[PDB]
Design a protein around this ligand. Sequence first.
Ligand SMILES: NC(=O)c1ccc[n+]([C@@H]2O[C@H](COP(=O)([O-])OP(=O)(O)OC[C@H]3O[C@@H](n4cnc5c(N)ncnc54)[C@H](OP(=O)(O)O)[C@@H]3O)[C@@H](O)[C@H]2O)c1
Ligand SMILES: Nc1nc(=O)c2nc(CNc3ccc(C(=O)N[C@@H](CCC(=O)O)C(=O)O)cc3)cnc2[nH]1
Length: 160
Amino acid sequence: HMISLIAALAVDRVIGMENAMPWNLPADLAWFKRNTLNKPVIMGRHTWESIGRPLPGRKNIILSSQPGTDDRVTWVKSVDEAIAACGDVPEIMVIGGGRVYEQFLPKAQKLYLTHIDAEVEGDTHFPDYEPDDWESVFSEFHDADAQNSHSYCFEILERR
Ligand SMILES: NC(=O)c1ccc[n+]([C@@H]2O[C@H](COP(=O)([O-])OP(=O)(O)OC[C@H]3O[C@@H](n4cnc5c(N)ncnc54)[C@H](OP(=O)(O)O)[C@@H]3O)[C@@H](O)[C@H]2O)c1
Ligand SMILES: Nc1nc(=O)c2nc(CNc3ccc(C(=O)N[C@@H](CCC(=O)O)C(=O)O)cc3)cnc2[nH]1
């Protein structure tokens, strides 16, 4: 198979605040749906709570050391089990949050990263990643507009 991480980062690699995403960027949410639809998505229990409902058209796999509390999604207790629950698929999408990104980054072949030109009070950060290990294979910058209040750049990195 192949493991990919997808995330949106504000300044200083901030990805969250008090278990929430403090911004609204509809173009980035559309990019997220386009790149995760019809794929399995792995997330940690905190991120499941922040989303609050299953993502439709995706197999939702939740990592937690505690028993599952919702039969609409798949609960797993380890990284190995999470990967196995995905089945034989071309690409597995890991959708955070911080503690989960840390664990899957050494396994990942691709990073789908949105860089948001926004300064945000945050407590959760994307993991420190060594830039030499990665090559940029796609980059697309967008200015702010009437629907998206900050400029942003989509990037796909591939492990060298
Ligand atoms: N901007 C973005 O792209 C983005 C993406 C995702 C999330 N976020 C933000 O990230 C923040 C949450 O990230 P987080 O780091 O606090 O928590 P998280 O990584 O979402 O989930 C952490 C929890 O997942 C479970 N877990 C993780 N690894 C496990 C393992 N190997 N085995 C078993 N259980 C495991 C544990 O749950 P138990 O305690 O139940 O064992 C752990 O407490 C929120 O602010 C969210 O909004 C942002
Ligand atoms: N690039 C990126 N941006 C994000 O905002 C993001 N968020 C998470 C975790 N949080 C969330 C929060 C909401 C939705 C969500 O509502 N998505 C719906 C609607 C998409 C839309 O409205 O365009 C979905 O169907 O994917 C997804 C993930 C993980 N990876 C990300 N990756």
